[PDB]
Design an enzyme around this catalytic site. Structure first.
Site, PDB file in Angstrom:
ATOM      1  N   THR A 134     -28.165 -25.221 -50.381  1.00 45.15           N
ATOM      2  CA  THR A 134     -29.151 -24.854 -49.315  1.00 45.15           C
ATOM      3  C   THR A 134     -28.799 -23.716 -48.133  1.00 45.15           C
ATOM      4  OG1 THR A 134     -30.517 -25.785 -47.573  1.00 45.15           O
ATOM      5  CG2 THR A 134     -28.318 -26.379 -47.531  1.00 45.15           C
ATOM      6  N   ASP A 180     -22.475 -34.658 -55.374  1.00 47.59           N
ATOM      7  CA  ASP A 180     -22.152 -33.694 -54.197  1.00 47.59           C
ATOM      8  C   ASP A 180     -20.981 -34.134 -53.509  1.00 47.59           C
ATOM      9  OD1 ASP A 180     -24.129 -31.805 -55.237  1.00 47.59           O
ATOM     10  OD2 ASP A 180     -25.482 -32.634 -53.927  1.00 47.59           O
TER      11      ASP A 180
HETATM   12  N1  ADP Z   1     -23.365 -34.897 -38.435  1.00 41.05           N
HETATM   13  C1  ADP Z   1     -23.453 -33.550 -38.412  1.00 41.05           C
HETATM   14  N2  ADP Z   1     -23.364 -32.800 -37.163  1.00 41.05           N
HETATM   15  C2  ADP Z   1     -23.647 -31.618 -37.265  1.00 41.05           C
HETATM   16  N3  ADP Z   1     -23.610 -30.619 -38.223  1.00 41.05           N
HETATM   17  C3  ADP Z   1     -23.669 -31.277 -39.402  1.00 41.05           C
HETATM   18  C4  ADP Z   1     -23.747 -32.744 -39.756  1.00 41.05           C
HETATM   19  N4  ADP Z   1     -23.700 -32.937 -41.038  1.00 41.05           N
HETATM   20  C5  ADP Z   1     -23.913 -31.591 -41.561  1.00 41.05           C
HETATM   21  N5  ADP Z   1     -23.884 -30.817 -40.768  1.00 41.05           N
HETATM   22  C6  ADP Z   1     -24.140 -29.281 -40.970  1.00 41.05           C
HETATM   23  O1  ADP Z   1     -25.116 -29.070 -42.126  1.00 41.05           O
HETATM   24  C7  ADP Z   1     -24.441 -27.925 -42.859  1.00 41.05           C
HETATM   25  C8  ADP Z   1     -24.951 -28.086 -44.510  1.00 41.05           C
HETATM   26  O2  ADP Z   1     -24.698 -29.306 -44.668  1.00 41.05           O
HETATM   27  P1  ADP Z   1     -24.886 -30.162 -46.146  1.00 41.05           P
HETATM   28  O3  ADP Z   1     -24.402 -31.425 -46.176  1.00 41.05           O
HETATM   29  O4  ADP Z   1     -24.404 -28.930 -47.041  1.00 41.05           O
HETATM   30  O5  ADP Z   1     -26.253 -30.254 -46.569  1.00 41.05           O
HETATM   31  P2  ADP Z   1     -26.909 -30.427 -48.003  1.00 41.05           P
HETATM   32  O6  ADP Z   1     -26.117 -31.723 -48.317  1.00 41.05           O
HETATM   33  O7  ADP Z   1     -28.494 -30.667 -47.935  1.00 41.05           O
HETATM   34  O8  ADP Z   1     -26.416 -29.326 -48.833  1.00 41.05           O
HETATM   35  C9  ADP Z   1     -22.977 -27.791 -42.581  1.00 41.05           C
HETATM   36  O9  ADP Z   1     -22.795 -26.551 -42.540  1.00 41.05           O
HETATM   37  C10 ADP Z   1     -22.935 -28.613 -41.401  1.00 41.05           C
HETATM   38  O10 ADP Z   1     -22.419 -27.782 -40.390  1.00 41.05           O
END
Ligand code: ADP
Ligand code: ADP
Ligand code: MG
Lengths: 94, 103, 77, 192, 49, 52, 191, 546
Positions: free
Chosen positions: H97, H402
């Site tokens: 994403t 993932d």
């Molecule tokens: N609990 C949280 N607090 C702040 N930021 C978060 C948190 N969880 C995820 N993020 C942010 O979201 C971004 C992408 O998350 P990701 O897990 O890759 O989403 P997806 O699983 O939809 O790909 C990361 O760069 C991270 O900084």
């Protein structure tokens, strides 16, 4: 006027993508334009000396007769001098 | 089994006529039909309210933040929503103030 | 910005020269197309009234603020 | 002599000249006996490893129930003695051509080679035989009787890595030192 | 009750354009930027027609 | 519409009316209202001086 | 409507016996006698079953007379193969002929060298597949790029025989319709 | 945009011809059109979406990996972002994403640089010097993996991968599950290099109680049904032998093109008997070996089922190839493609059999699964996910899949960095001072490259339906002081990000969110290589199909 309003709306595009509300962007321009009008009054001059010729050369720009301004501006200045003050009839220049 | 009897004694009235009783959650749908254009009024009340573009079939455009005015041009199907149109129209004619509130 | 792009000149060298040279170029500092340089416009005898500038900003500010207070679009038929 | 192998994956910065001949095709992994080879003798097989038959169609009859025991034993025996000659020549890596007309390998032949720790591959282009033979210094083989150690090459490390999904077989070094060596470089990239 | 269909009452007329979401006001800006692109090179004496 | 979170601005305004009319006369808690622009919390500096 | 027809149409003589306990005898045995007669006709028509390696004088008879058959328009399809041993596609097509010959005994499978077939034939155009029927050429097929080329399979060859009208679509011998016993076993369990 | 251009004016092409800045604008709108569906799915505040196949079938998906793969786009400039989402899923397995949003904004923010008469060759050069300067700064700001007396790391790594999912609230329960799963299925290769094969654990689509009560299996779970119903379902006792066969066990015909022909009709029945007997001789020696459980890739005929029912053997048909390698690897057996040896004789040795402590067949909501637990040689693991339906579990299956890739990378590379847009905001302060040093035209390229990196923390606030500039301005203030920290720890105002559930800036180390640095490295290069591919195109030539 048009290439300027489009830039303000194009510059307001990423702020609308953000969490900025609509009224905040309008308050900035409406408060800034009040200072721009007052600033332009200071940029402008109160000129009275030297008694038309130079203003006509710039208004003819971006089109045909700009290059022929040496001949058209000499007689175009005489067009409005025939008109007296406070009447300014446009149909007489038909 | 392949096809229903498709509502017998329906020839009492014309085919185009339809009934809508309180049952089957239809009063909830009429509240939801109000909720469609009511949310349009949420962003139009107050000093920070946003105007609305209304392009008529003739092309005459009016941009506005007032309820009673915007509802004149929109052709409405739901009768319960038209009660709000004429209710705001009464507000504009008599007092000329407080039409969003009526809505 | 666009006035110099149509002239074929690079915008970065122009726009960097305008900002850092407003101190001595108090008010009459602008672009010159003849010499392919930037200098004082009072010596070149190029003039323009102020009424174009006031009505441009007022009309442009009124134009952008009109639809900026709009988040809807209704089109019957 | 300069082959450009296209592998989808990675980045262009990872592109580098491979010392030995890089193979594009992946391993079969039907048996999956060996994992990583060291000091392996490479051989190029041009014939097909199959039960005994000519290239044309044949008819085999069975007039007694005892004949099936000899048929099932002798069919694998023809595969067995080939593996014995491969073991006598200590050939650790085999390269088998495509061979659409006759079956290249089967589950029986893969099982005997799985015990000896010998990798196998398929889907080799007929035009690339000049590149593999001149590069690795291994003469081809088209008959089991003429198979010997003098016709085989040598290498220090022959392995198959899985670098983030992109599977590639790589050979390192050639000890033959022929007259005109060859060049092999893999091209990696984000997009095809 | 007078018909087996019982059609669901739509609020607006058929053919009316879409409504609130993401990209409504951005389309109006892009529409103005599109018209602004045509009048873009016509600025100044060294412009075009 | 003012770009503020309603979950924090609304119950903050209820505190002006949950402190209902004590024994002292001339109570000025009736002029408390929302605010579109400005101070945090939001109860407006009266609608008074504002002349609305 | 099709639910009544699937009882008889979608079951061979071996599969029709499944409905012996469920369906009526007179309804079932009336159709089994019909399907039994159709099986007897195919046995009488099974005049072939191996590739006829012929030569030219004979072509003027084997390929064409056969195509007339009984001439009751008892036509017979005759698949000719102008073989060329140097080409790789020719040896593949020769294997498909012997495989199909063991299954489809009513269709004649003919093979001949291409050099002996036509005077100075182009070697590039080989292998060539001709299909005769009642003396007329139904299909003059070109090299097997249409049928996958080097990757031609038995399933592609059987599909071509259905297009020229040599084998019916719902024939039980075709691999498309001849589902495996393990496939039908899973269907009955999950039903 | 405005109107269609002239069709081959004195050029004589069968297709369409377009040139100039119009197609460059269409590529920007093309990358923004496909990026808008990815905008709302970013961060924990993002919401899921559903794609309908016009047949009733639908699937819920949050990550842009399979969403863009399902969305069939015909514009070729958008296909590169479609393949970029698939590329990032293969190597890293997380952040699909983010690369679409980062790559789209780099092209969008660079669109202003095109009409400034800055060449794309100079723009990408300014982006590339900003890239390698950013990678070295990422290599400086990374932290060690100890951080305390205990581990206290792998539980926090799972929360970042588990965020923005349906089961993000249950991540506290699933955090212990994923770390216990991958530590069980480790292996050894390359003389000391530890590997973690992703997808080796079995993700079962079960229905029942809830996602909170999902029991972690201490062993592998095979998803297949029993052959016969009269067999024993539960096998107790220690040292249960596991046999992994792949040869054809059902009755098969002779060789692929031979014909059976015989003159004497007396031996016609005998050849029928030995064909039925030769397949049972293989089953006879397995009973002599004493294998309680036998698994076969191919089918199992009824002639073999009678011997397993009599001797109380668990025969299971319809196994797959990739599963039995993990059964043999876990239980300690070896894969048997055929029964033979170097000698001419045919026999079966007891060394081919595996060992396990217990094997039990369980059924839950029409899902029969054979639970194999207690492998002696090497441990294994499986996760039984439970939810509403199969389409909801597909999001959970991708959520777990993932999560394994993210926990794989933090163990392969101990270096990590905090989330919440920390490094995305830190690079802006680092590149602004570097942009002034280089002097000439690359200042705007490096500056606008830094401005495009801020879109990651901005999108977290936009999707949260909160005020974004206050959080960005506060995050900008702390990161602005980090470069001017004045070292003598008291090096504070670093390693901070956004907290969306409360709307404050707090320490991400204490909050318990981290991400490996290698994901940031590959995402930046793959995003810039995609940006290089779109910027360098000038004119399109679309040929219609014949
Ligand atoms: N609990 C949280 N607090 C702040 N930021 C978060 C948190 N969880 C995820 N993020 C942010 O979201 C971004 C992408 O998350 P990701 O897990 O890759 O989403 P997806 O699983 O939809 O790909 C990361 O760069 C991270 O900084
Ligand atoms: N600057 C302001 N500060 C606080 N409240 C305001 C302000 N301007 C307007 N309001 C409130 O918003 C309400 C909007 O009333 P509205 O129904 O829009 O009036 P109208 O009938 O003219 O449309 C008013 O009742 C007023 O109390
Ligand atoms: Mg993730």
């Amino acid at each position: 006027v048009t290439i300027l309003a489009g830039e303000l709306m194009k510059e307001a595009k990423p702020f609308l993508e953000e969490g900025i509300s609509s009224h905040l962007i309008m308050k900035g321009y409406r408060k800034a334009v009040s200072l721009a009008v007052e600033k332009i009054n200071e940029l402008a001059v109160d000129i009275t000396s030297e008694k038309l010729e130079r203003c006509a050369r710039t208004a003819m720009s971006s089109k045909l007769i700009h290059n022929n301004a040496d001949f058209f501006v000499k007689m175009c200045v005489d067009a409005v001098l025939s008109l007296d003050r406070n009447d300014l009839d446009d149909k007489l220049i038909g | 089994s392949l096809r229903l009897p498709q509502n017998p004694n329906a020839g009492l009235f014309k085919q185009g006529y339809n009934s809508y009783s309180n049952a089957d959650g239809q009063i909830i749908k009429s509240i939801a039909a109000i909720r469609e254009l009511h949310q349009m009024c949420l962003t139009s009340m107050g000093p920070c309210g946003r105007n609305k573009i209304i392009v008529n079939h003739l092309g005459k455009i009016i941009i506005t933040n007032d309820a009673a005015t915007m509802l004149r041009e929109l052709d409405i199907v739901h009768p319960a929503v038209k009660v709000l149109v004429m209710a705001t129209e009464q507000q504009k004619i008599d007092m000329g103030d407080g039409t969003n509130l009526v809505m | 910005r666009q006035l110099c792009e149509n002239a074929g000149f690079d915008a970065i060298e122009i726009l960097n020269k305008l900002r850092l040279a407003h101190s001595k170029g108090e008010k009459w500092y602008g672009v010159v197309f003849e010499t392919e340089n930037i200098g004082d416009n009072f010596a070149k005898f190029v003039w323009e009234p102020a009424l174009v500038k006031i009505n441009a900003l007022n009309s442009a500010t009124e134009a952008t603020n009109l639809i900026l207070s709009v988040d809807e679009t209704i089109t019957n038929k | 002599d300069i082959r450009l192998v296209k592998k989808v994956g990675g980045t262009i910065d990872d592109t580098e000249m491979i010392d030995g001949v890089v193979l594009t095709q992946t391993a079969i992994k039907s048996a999956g006996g060996p994992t990583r080879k060291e000091k392996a003798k490479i051989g190029l097989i041009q014939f097909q490893i199959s039960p005994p038959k000519p290239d044309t169609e044949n008819n085999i009859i069975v007039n007694d129930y005892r004949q099936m025991d000899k048929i099932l034993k002798e069919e694998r025996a023809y595969l067995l003695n080939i593996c014995k000659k491969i073991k006598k020549a200590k050939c650790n890596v085999l390269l088998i051509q495509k061979s659409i007309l006759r079956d290249a390998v089967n589950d029986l032949a893969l099982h005997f080679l799985s015990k000896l720790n010998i990798m196998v591959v398929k889907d080799i282009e007929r035009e690339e035989i000049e590149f593999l033979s001149k590069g690795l210094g291994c003469k081809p083989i088209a008959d089991i009787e003429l198979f010997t150690e003098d016709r085989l090459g040598s290498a220090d490390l022959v392995e198959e890595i899985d670098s983030d999904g992109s599977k590639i077989v790589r050979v390192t070094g050639i000890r033959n030192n022929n007259a005109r060596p060859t060049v092999s470089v893999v091209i990696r990239g984000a997009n095809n | 009750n007078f018909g087996s269909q019982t059609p669901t009452i739509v609020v607006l007329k058929e053919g009316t354009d879409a409504s609130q979401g993401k990209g409504q006001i951005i389309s109006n800006i892009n529409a103005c930027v599109a018209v602004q692109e045509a009048l873009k090179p016509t600025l100044g004496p060294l412009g075009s027609d | 519409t003012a770009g503020l979170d309603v979950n924090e601005v609304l119950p903050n305004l209820y505190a002006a009316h949950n402190v209902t009319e004590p024994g002292a006369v001339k109570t000025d808690h009736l002029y408390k209202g929302v605010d579109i622009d400005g101070e945090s919390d939001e109860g407006v500096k009266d609608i008074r001086e504002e002349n609305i | 409507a099709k639910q009544h027809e699937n009882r008889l149409e979608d079951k061979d003589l071996s599969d029709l016996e499944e409905l012996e306990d469920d369906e009526d005898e007179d309804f079932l045995e009336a159709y089994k006698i019909k399907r039994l007669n159709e099986i007897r006709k195919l046995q009488e028509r099974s005049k072939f079953g191996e590739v006829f390696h012929i030569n030219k004088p004979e072509y003027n008879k084997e390929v064409t007379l056969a195509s007339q058959g009984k001439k009751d328009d008892g036509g017979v399809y005759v698949f000719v193969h102008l073989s060329l041993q140097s080409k790789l596609q020719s040896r593949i097509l020769s294997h498909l002929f012997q495989s199909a010959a063991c299954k489809f005994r009513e269709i004649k499978f003919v093979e001949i060298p291409a050099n002996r077939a036509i005077e100075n034939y182009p070697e590039s155009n080989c292998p060539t597949l001709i299909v005769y029927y009642r003396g007329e050429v139904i299909k003059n097929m070109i090299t097997l790029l249409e049928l996958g080329g080097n990757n031609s399979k038995m399933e592609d060859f059987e599909d071509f025989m259905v297009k020229v009208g040599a084998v019916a679509e719902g024939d039980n011998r075709l691999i498309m319709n001849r589902d495996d016993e393990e496939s039908r076993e899973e269907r009955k369990l999950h039903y | 945009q405005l109107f269609n251009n002239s069709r081959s004016d004195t050029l004589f092409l069968g297709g369409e011809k377009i040139s100039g800045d119009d197609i460059r604008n269409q590529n920007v709108l093309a990358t923004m059109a496909v990026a808008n569906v990815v905008k709302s799915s970013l961060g924990p505040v993002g919401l899921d979406k559903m794609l309908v196949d016009d047949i009733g079938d639908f699937t819920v998906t949050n990550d842009g990996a399979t969403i863009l793969s399902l969305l069939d786009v015909q514009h070729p400039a958008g296909k590169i972002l479609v393949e970029l989402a698939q590329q990032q899923d293969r190597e890293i397995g997380d952040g699909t994403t983010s690369v679409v949003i980062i790559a789209s904004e780099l092209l969008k923010r660079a669109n202003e640089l095109v009409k400034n008469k800055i060449h794309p060759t100079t723009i990408i050069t300014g982006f590339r010097v900003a890239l390698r300067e950013a990678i070295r700064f990422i290599n400086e700001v990374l932290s060690t993996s100890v951080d305390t007396l205990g581990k206290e790391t792998l539980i926090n790594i799972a929360k970042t991968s588990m965020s923005s999912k349906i089961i993000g609230a249950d991540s506290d329960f699933f955090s212990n599950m994923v770390v216990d799963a991958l530590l069980a299925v480790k292996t050894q290769n390359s003389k000391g290099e530890i590997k973690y094969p992703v997808k080796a654990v079995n993700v079962l689509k079960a229905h029942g109680k809830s996602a909170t009560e999902s029991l972690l299996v201490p062993g592998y779970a095979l998803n297949c049904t029993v052959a016969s119903q009269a067999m024993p379902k539960r096998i107790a006792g220690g040292n249960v032998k596991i046999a992994c066969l792949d040869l054809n066990l059902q009755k098969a015909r002779m060789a692929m093109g031979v014909q059976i022909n015989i003159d004497d009709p007396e031996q016609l029945e005998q050849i029928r008997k030995r064909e039925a007997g030769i397949v049972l001789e293989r089953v006879k020696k397995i009973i002599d070996a004493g294998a309680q459980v036998v698994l076969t890739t191919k089918g199992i005929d009824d002639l073999c089922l009678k011997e397993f029912v009599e001797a109380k053997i668990m025969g299971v048909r319809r196994c797959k190839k990739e599963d039995l390698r993990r059964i043999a690897r876990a239980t300690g057996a070896t894969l048997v493609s055929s029964m033979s040896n170097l000698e001419g004789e045919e026999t079966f040795e007891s060394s081919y059999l595996g060992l396990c402590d217990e094997v039990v067949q369980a059924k839950f909501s029409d899902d029969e699964c054979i639970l194999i637990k207690g492998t002696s040689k090497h441990s294994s693991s499986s996760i039984i996910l439970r939810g509403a339906n199969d389409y909801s579990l597909d999001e959970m299956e991708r959520s777990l899949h993932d999560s394994l890739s993210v926990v794989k990378r933090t163990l392969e590379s101990g270096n990590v960095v905090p989330g919440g847009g920390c490094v995305e905001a830190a690079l802006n302060i680092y590149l602004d001072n570097f942009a002034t040093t280089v002097g000439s035209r690359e200042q705007l390229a490096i500056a606008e490259f830094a401005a495009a990196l801020l879109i990651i923390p901005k999108t977290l606030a936009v999707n949260a339906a909160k005020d974004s500039s206050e959080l960005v301005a506060k995050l900008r203030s702390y990161h602005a002081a980090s470069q001017m920290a004045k070292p003598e720890k008291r090096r504070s105002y670093r390693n901070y990000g956004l907290d969306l559930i409360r709307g404050k800036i707090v320490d991400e180390i204490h909050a318990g969110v981290l991400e490996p640095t290698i994901s940031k490295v590959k995402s930046l290069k793959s995003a810039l290589e995609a940006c290089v591919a779109i910027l360098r195109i000038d004119t399109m030539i679309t040929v219609d199909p014949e």
